[PDB]
Amino acid sequence: PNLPPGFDFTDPAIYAERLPVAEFAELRSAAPIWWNGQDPGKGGGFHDGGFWAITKLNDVKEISRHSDVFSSYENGVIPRFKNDIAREDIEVQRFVMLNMDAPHHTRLRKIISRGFTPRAVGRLHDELQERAQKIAAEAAAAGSGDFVEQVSCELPLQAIAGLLGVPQEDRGKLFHWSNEMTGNEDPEYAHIDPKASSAELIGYAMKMAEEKAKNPADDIVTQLIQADIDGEKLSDDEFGFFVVMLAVAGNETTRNSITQGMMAFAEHPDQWELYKKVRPETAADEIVRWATPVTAFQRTALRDYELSGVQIKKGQRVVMFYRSANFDEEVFQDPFTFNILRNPNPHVGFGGTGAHYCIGANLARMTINLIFNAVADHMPDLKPISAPERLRSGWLNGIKHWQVDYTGRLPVAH
Numbered sequence: 217p218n219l220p221p222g223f224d225f226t227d228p229a230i231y232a233e234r235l236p237v238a239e240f241a242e243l244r245s246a247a248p249i250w251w252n253g254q255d256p257g258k259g260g261g262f263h264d265g266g267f268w269a270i271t272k273l274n275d276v277k278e279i280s281r282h283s284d285v286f287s288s289y290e291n292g293v294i295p296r297f298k299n300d301i302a303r304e305d306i307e308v309q310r311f312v313m314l315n316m317d318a319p320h321h322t323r324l325r326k327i328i329s330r331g332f333t334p335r336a337v338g339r340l341h342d343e344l345q346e347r348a349q350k351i352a353a354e355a356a357a358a359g360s361g362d363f364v365e366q367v368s369c370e371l372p373l374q375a376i377a378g379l380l381g382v383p384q385e386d387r388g389k390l391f392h393w394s395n396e397m398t399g400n401e402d403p404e405y406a407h408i409d410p411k412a413s414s415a416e417l418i419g420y421a422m423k424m425a426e427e428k429a430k431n432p433a434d435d436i437v438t439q440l441i442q443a444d445i446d447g448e449k450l451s452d453d454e455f456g457f458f459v460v461m462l463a464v465a466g467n468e469t470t471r472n473s474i475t476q477g478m479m480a481f482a483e484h485p486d487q488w489e490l491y492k493k494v495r496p497e498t499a500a501d502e503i504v505r506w507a508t509p510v511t512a513f514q515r516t517a518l519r520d521y522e523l524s525g526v527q528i529k530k531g532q533r534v535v536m537f538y539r540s541a542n543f544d545e546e547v548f549q550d551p552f553t554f555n556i557l558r559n560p561n562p563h564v565g566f567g568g569t570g571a572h573y574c575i576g577a578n579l580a581r582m583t584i585n586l587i588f589n590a591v592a593d594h595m596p597d598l599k600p601i602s603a604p605e606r607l608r609s610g611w612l613n614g615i616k617h618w619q620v621d622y623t624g625r626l627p628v629a630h
């Protein structure tokens with residue numbers, strides 16, 4: 217393919233500036249499974265010399281379905297850390313369900329599923345709609361400001377707190393810990409240590425589990441720590457690892473779907489007018505496909521496996537570029553058109569179908585719908601002031617800041 221020598225699709229220096237949309241398109245056309253070599257020292261923590269870049273949706277689905285071959289546990293799913301990360305800090309990811317394989321994954325996923333039933337998630341609708349309205353109103357009253365802080369950040373965190381029944385007076389500290397826990401290489405956050413925040417959150421969660429076992433209630437935490445008919449339940453530490461997992465899994469991801477959904481609405485005012493008018497049930501999925509908050513997750517082959525004519529060898533990493541797959545011209549009609557009516561929309565922003573497919577997908581869609589309803593109600597005319605500031609990460613597609621005029625009336629500053 218026509219790519220610069222040395223090009224690495226996991227390079228956080230790319231994403232601090234842009235999404236490499238042209239280069240993904242070049243691989244889908246010229247080399248849809250492509251060996252991305254990595255130089256000595258520059259492996260993002262993996263010392264294997266490179267990985268297979270997976271760029272087509274059908275191949276992302278195939279890998280995702282064949283979890284008996286393509287393991288999450290062996291090297292975890294994050295394809296990029298600081299280059300000098302210790303191996304034990306990659307392996308500590310195995311304590312959370314996202315980085316487990318069957319059969320251990322299968323048991324935990326069945327228990328954790330109790331928290332994500334339609335009823336469990338449905339129960340959060342009213343508090344989240346009230347909060348979404350309050351968020352948007354307060355931002356509108358500020359006139360202008362950082363959309364990421366003032367509109368995108370809070371609701372995903374309130375969804376996690378509501379789910380876990382975190383007392384109101386504990387939410388600031390919970391959110392503080394959570395916001396320190398999705399590591400990145402961004403110089404703006406170079407002073408933060410995820411490990412200490414993670415240990416505080418796990419201890420807080422374990423105390424909650426102990427208390428709820430003693431005073432069970434009609435809530436999701438009680439369901440998780442009480443034995444079902446098969447005797448299965450989360451131990452206290454397992455409950456702590458579930459909370460730690462959510463603090464990353466359901467935080468920056470939904471946050472970025474909100475920021476980048478609004479960026480797409482600013483870029484496509486026809487879609488924003490359509491949205492405000494009809495508030496269509498298909499909008500959240502198009503927002504997720506367009507935002508693709510997780511650029512990529514990886515797997516490791518547990519045996520040689522041929523994928524679309526390419527021999528993957530045992531031990532090699534494959535990196536599923538959801539950012540590429542979600543724009544695959546053989547699966548979507550006009551993938552580079554932002555269309556909030558798109559249906560079907562077989563995007564992989566929540567992963568390919570398979571064991572690990574996002575268990576929070578419906579909660580995330582509800583979050584997105586409630587906050588955009590509130591934005592439509594309170595700041596229908598909002599206009600950006602300056603360009604988004606992207607996050608330096610080689611796997612998360614993040615926006616740190618985006619200055620916006622909620623009134624739409626401020627004139628151009630010179």
Ligand code: HEM
Nearest residue numbers: 313314465466469470473565566567568572573574576580
């Ligand atoms: C738009 C927002 C979101 C996006 C783009 C997203 C994306 C993803 C992706 C790509 C995966 C891995 C899928 C795979 O490997 O096949 C995943 C897993 C997961 N997500 Fe989400 N997610 C979002 C919101 C949420 C929310 C709101 C929560 C919970 C509050 C959540 C909880 C989880 C959990 C617990 C896993 C692990 C599932 C497993 O390993 O079995 N996610 N998510």
